[PDB]
Amino acid sequence: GHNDYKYIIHPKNRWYKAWEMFILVWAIYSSLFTPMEFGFFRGLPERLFVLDIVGQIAFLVDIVLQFFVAYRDTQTYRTVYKPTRIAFRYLKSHFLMDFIGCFPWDLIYKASGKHELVRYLLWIRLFRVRKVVEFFQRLEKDTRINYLFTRILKLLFVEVYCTHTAACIFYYLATTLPPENEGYTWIGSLKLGDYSYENFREIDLWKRYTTALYFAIVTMATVGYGDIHAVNLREMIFVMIYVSFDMVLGAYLIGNITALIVKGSNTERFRDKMNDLISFMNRKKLGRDLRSQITGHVRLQYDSHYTDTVMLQDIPASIRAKIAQLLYLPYIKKVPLFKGCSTEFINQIVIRLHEEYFLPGEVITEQGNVVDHLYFVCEGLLEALVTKTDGSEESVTLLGPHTSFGDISIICNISQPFTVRVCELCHLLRLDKQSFSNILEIYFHDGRTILNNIMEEKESNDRIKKLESDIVIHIGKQEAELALKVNSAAFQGDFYQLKSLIRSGADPNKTDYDGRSPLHLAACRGYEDITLFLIQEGVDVNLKDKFGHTPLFEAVKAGQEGVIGLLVKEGASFNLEDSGNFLCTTVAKGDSDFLKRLLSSGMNPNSEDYDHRTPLHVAASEGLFLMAKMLVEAGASVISKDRWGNSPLDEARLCGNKKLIKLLEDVKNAQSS
Amino acid sequence: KLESDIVIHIGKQEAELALKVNSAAFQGDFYQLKSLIRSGADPNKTDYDGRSPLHLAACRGYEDITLFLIQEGVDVNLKDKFGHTPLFEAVKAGQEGVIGLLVK
Amino acid sequence: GEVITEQGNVVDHLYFVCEGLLEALVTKTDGSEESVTLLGPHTSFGDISIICNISQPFTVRVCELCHLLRLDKQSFSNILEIYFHDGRTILNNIMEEKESNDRIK
Numbered sequence: 001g002h003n004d005y006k007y008i009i010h011p012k013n014r015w016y017k018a019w020e021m022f023i024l025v026w027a028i029y030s031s032l033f034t035p036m037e038f039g040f041f042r043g044l045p046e047r048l049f050v051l052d053i054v055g056q057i058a059f060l061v062d063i064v065l066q067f068f069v070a071y072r073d074t075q076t077y078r079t080v081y082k083p084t085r086i087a088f089r090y091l092k093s094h095f096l097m098d099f100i101g102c103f104p105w106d107l108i109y110k111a112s113g114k115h116e117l118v119r120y121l122l123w124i125r126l127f128r129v130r131k132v133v134e135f136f137q138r139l140e141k142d143t144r145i146n147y148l149f150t151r152i153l154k155l156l157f158v159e160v161y162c163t164h165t166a167a168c169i170f171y172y173l174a175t176t177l178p179p180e181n182e183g184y185t186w187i188g189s190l191k192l193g194d195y196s197y198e199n200f201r202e203i204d205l206w207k208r209y210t211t212a213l214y215f216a217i218v219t220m221a222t223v224g225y226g227d228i229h230a231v232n233l234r235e236m237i238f239v240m241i242y243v244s245f246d247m248v249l250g251a252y253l254i255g256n257i258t259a260l261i262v263k264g265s266n267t268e269r270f271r272d273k274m275n276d277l278i279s280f281m282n283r284k285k286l287g288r289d290l291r292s293q294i295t296g297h298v299r300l301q302y303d304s305h306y307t308d309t310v311m312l313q314d315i316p317a318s319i320r321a322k323i324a325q326l327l328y329l330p331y332i333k334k335v336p337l338f339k340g341c342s343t344e345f346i347n348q349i350v351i352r353l354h355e356e357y358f359l360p361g362e363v364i365t366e367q368g369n370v371v372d373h374l375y376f377v378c379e380g381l382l383e384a385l386v387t388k389t390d391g392s393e394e395s396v397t398l399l400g401p402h403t404s405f406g407d408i409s410i411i412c413n414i415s416q417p418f419t420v421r422v423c424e425l426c427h428l429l430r431l432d433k434q435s436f437s438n439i440l441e442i443y444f445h446d447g448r449t450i451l452n453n454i455m456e457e458k459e460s461n462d463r464i465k466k467l468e469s470d471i472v473i474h475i476g477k478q479e480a481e482l483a484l485k486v487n488s489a490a491f492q493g494d495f496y497q498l499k500s501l502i503r504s505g506a507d508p509n510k511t512d513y514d515g516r517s518p519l520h521l522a523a524c525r526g527y528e529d530i531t532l533f534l535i536q537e538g539v540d541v542n543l544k545d546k547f548g549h550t551p552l553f554e555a556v557k558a559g560q561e562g563v564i565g566l567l568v569k570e571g572a573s574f575n576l577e578d579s580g581n582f583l584c585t586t587v588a589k590g591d592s593d594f595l596k597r598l599l600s601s602g603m604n605p606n607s608e609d610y611d612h613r614t615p616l617h618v619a620a621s622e623g624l625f626l627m628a629k630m631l632v633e634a635g636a637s638v639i640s641k642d643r644w645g646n647s648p649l650d651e652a653r654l655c656g657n658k659k660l661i662k663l664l665e666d667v668k669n670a671q672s673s
Numbered sequence: 674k675l676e677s678d679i680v681i682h683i684g685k686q687e688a689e690l691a692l693k694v695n696s697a698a699f700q701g702d703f704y705q706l707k708s709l710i711r712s713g714a715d716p717n718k719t720d721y722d723g724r725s726p727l728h729l730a731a732c733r734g735y736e737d738i739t740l741f742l743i744q745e746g747v748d749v750n751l752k753d754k755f756g757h758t759p760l761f762e763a764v765k766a767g768q769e770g771v772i773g774l775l776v777k
Numbered sequence: 778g779e780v781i782t783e784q785g786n787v788v789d790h791l792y793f794v795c796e797g798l799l800e801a802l803v804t805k806t807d808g809s810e811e812s813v814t815l816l817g818p819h820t821s822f823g824d825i826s827i828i829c830n831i832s833q834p835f836t837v838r839v840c841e842l843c844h845l846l847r848l849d850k851q852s853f854s855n856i857l858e859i860y861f862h863d864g865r866t867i868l869n870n871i872m873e874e875k876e877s878n879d880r881i882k
Contacts, residue, residue, distance in 0.1 A: 477696075477700065488689065488692060488721055492721070494681060497678075512722070514724060521721060524754075549755075
C-alpha cells in the first residue's frame, strides 16, 4: 500500500498486463512491417497512411505509460514507486530508440525531397523487437514451458525474422539499381516458368514479397534451387553475409534442439534404468514375484525422489526448519520415544530427518548389527522379529504409525535385538546414528536434560536393563556439570539463576562431586528463600553427603534458625553416625549454642562413645553446669553407667559442682520415677 | 533488564573454571585439567565447598592429576570447609600411590 | 598448510604418512599451537583416538605435499576385532608410546 501516488500503476496490474500483451502484438507487426516498408516501398502508397499513423501513436502512448509503471530494483528488490526514478530509468536505457522510432519517418522522408538516407532511419523501429525479447524473457522464467523449448521457439522466431528481413533487404538491393539495369538485378533477370519479372517495380507487392521470401526461406535451409540467385556484386555480398550468419543461426538451432533431446527427462532417465534392469532380469530369468519386487522398488525410488528432500538444502535454515516442521514434526511429536521433551530438541531432530519409503518385505535393520539409523515409523505398518538361527522368524513387535525403532541399539551402542522388516508402504523418517548422538552430544544441552528424559522413556520400557554407554556417560558428565552450576547458584545466593537453572530441566535432587545437594548448600550458607525454593522442589532434607552431613546438620552448623525450622517442618533429621561422639566433642568445645541447636533439632543426648560416655557424662566431668541443663532438658540420662560405671551423677561429684550435682539428683529422682 | 549475568559468570570465572577443574579431576581426565589449569585458571581457587582440585583429585587418587596439581604447587596442607586436607581424603580412599605422591 | 584432524574431534580416519612432513600442533586459547612432533614418512596418526575411543590429542597440520593413506575407524576396528592377536600386538606398540599417553590404564 506504499503506492500513495495516484499516477504510478503496479507492473503486474491486470490492465497493464493486457496493455503489455497488446503492444507486443504491435511490436511484432511494426517490427515485421518496417523491413517491408523499407524494401518494397520507397514511400508508403498513401492507402497505408492511416495504419502508419495509428502504429506510431500506439508506441508513442506506450513511451508515456513507461513513466507511470513501478520497476523492481536490482539492488533492493522493491517496486520503486518514485516517479523521478522511473522517469530517469526510462530516459537512460530505452528512450532514445523508442522516441526516434516513433517519428513519422515516412512523412519526414517525403518532406526532405524523398532522400534515401532519411529512409535508412526506418530501421530504428527494429528496436521494437525488444518487446518480443522481453516477452521471451518472461516466458523463459516460467515452469509452464520448458527452457530449451523456449530457446527453440525463440530461435525459430529469430529465424523467421531474419528470413523476412533478408528477403526485404534482397529486394531493396534489387531496387537500388536504376530500372534501366533491371537485367543486372536478381529479380529483373528472373524468368520463373513462363512469368518474367521484367518490370519488377510494377508487380503486386505480394508477388515480389513472396519471391524474395521464397529466396530467403530456401537460402535459410540452404536448398539453393538456383532458380532465384544473386546477380549483382551488392547482392553477392549481402547473400554472403546472410548465408554466413544463417550458418551460425541454423547451427544454434540444431544445437538447442539437440540439447533439449539430450537433456533427459526424469521419466526418461528412470526408463533407461528400468530397461537395463529388465534386460538383466531376463538374463537371470527371475520369477514374476521377484521381478515385481525389483520393479516396484525401483518405481518407489523413482516416485519418492529422496534427493528432492535434500533439494532445498540451499534455502535458509529458517525456512528449511519451517518445511521440516510442517512435514515431519507432527509425526515426531507423537513418537513415544520423544514423549515429554523440549520442543527445541524435537525441532533439531526433525531438521535432521530424511524421509524414506519402503515396499513390503524388505528388512530395514538387521538383528545382530549395531544400528546406525534410527527410524520413525510414521506411515505403514512395520514388523519386528528376531529370526532364530534355525531360520524361524519370531515377530516380537508390530510397529505401526507414530512409533520408533533402532533407538535402543544407538543409545546402547549394542546390536539390534530384532530384525525389522516392512509390511505395508512404510513411510519412515530415518535419523543417522551420528546425527542423533550429536543432537545429544554435539548439540549439548539439546542432548542433556532432554536425553535424560529419553533415558526415562527407555527405562520405562521396563524390558531395557542397560547399564552404561558412551552416550550415557557423556550425558552424565553434562548433568554433573549442570549440577555444579545449580549448586554454585544455591551456594552463591543467586536466586534468579538457580530458578532458571532448575526450571530449564535440571533435577533439583542432583549432587556435586562430593555428594552435596543444593539443599545442603542452601542450608550451609543459610539462604532462607533458596532453601524454601528448593524445599518446594522436593530435594531430600535428610540427604546424606560424602560425610553424612544432612541439610539440617549444615543448617545447624550455620546457625540459621529459619532454615532449620523449615527443614524440621519438612522433616529433616539428624541421621548422623557417631552421634554421641560428635555431641561429646561439642560438649568438650564448650559451644553452648551449638549443642543447644543440635538438641533442639532432636539429637539424642544419651548416645555413648568408644569410652561409652554420654554427652552428659562429659559435661559432668567437665563441670559444665549449663550444658548439663540443656542436656537435662533434652533428656540425657544422668544415671547411665559408662565403661567404669561412672554415671554423670558420679562425674559431677568428682568435679565438685554442688549445684550441678543437685540439679542432676533432681533429675535422678525424675528418672527413677 | 535481566542484566548482571556478567558478574555472575565472573564469580564463576573464579568458580566455574575452578569447578570445571574439580570436575575433570573427579572424572579423571588429565589432559583436560592440563589445558584448563594452564589456559584457564590455577587450582589454588577452591569450589563453594572450599574443596581444591587437589582435594577431589586426592580423594579419587588419580596421581597423574595430583602430580600436575603438585607442579602447579597447590597447598598440600589446605583444609576444606569440612576441615579435611587432601592427604586425609587420600588415606580415606586408601590411594597409596596418591598417598605417596602427597607425602613426597 | 591444511588440517586433517583437529584437537578434540574423535578421529574417525586413521592416516599414514607415505611422503611429506606433518606436524602435531596443540591448539589452545593462546594461539601458540604446540608442536608436539613432526610426522615424517612411514608414521601414523589418529591411531590413539580410534583405538582408545578418545578425542584427538593434537591437531595434525600439513607442512609439505603429503601423500597419506587413510583407514576409516569402523574398518580399522573391524580388522582389529578380527585379528585379536594382532590388535594385542598393536596395543603393546602403542603402550610403549602410552608411557606418556597413559590411555591403556
